[PDB]
């Protein structure tokens, strides 16, 4: 994944998730993508209520992108792998 500053364009399924979280732009930095992904998970309350580093994304469009039913914020590889599949570097 590109560093800080580099601009990326998300593929449509990911862009849609970011738009749900309030994103109005079409071009992002990776950190901005991560901001809106966190916003989305928070707004949709996909985090486990008792162990909140666990995200339950099954039965949500986010899980179709991540290809896993749950993940840990402390084990973010599925997130990064998804971003590599879904970000076009500009």
């Amino acid at each position: 994944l590109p560093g800080e500053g580099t601009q990326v364009h998300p593929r449509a399924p990911l862009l849609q998730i970011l738009k749900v979280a309030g994103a109005q732009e079409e071009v992002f930095t990776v950190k901005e993508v991560m901001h809106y992904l966190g916003q989305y998970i928070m707004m949709k309350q996909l985090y486990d209520k008792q162990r909140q580093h666990i995200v339950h994304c099954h039965d949500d469009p986010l899980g179709e992108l991540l290809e896993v039913g749950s993940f840990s914020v402390k084990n973010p590889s599925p997130l990064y792998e998804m971003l590599k599949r879904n970000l076009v570097i500009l």
């Binding site: 991560m34 985090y47 402390k74």
Partner: peptide, 14 residues
């Protein structure tokens, strides 16, 4: 007892 919002911000900035 950390919240999701604090946990994700740590990820985001790391």
């Amino acid at each position: 007892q950390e919240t999701f919002x604090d946990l994700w911000k740590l990820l985001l900035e790391n």
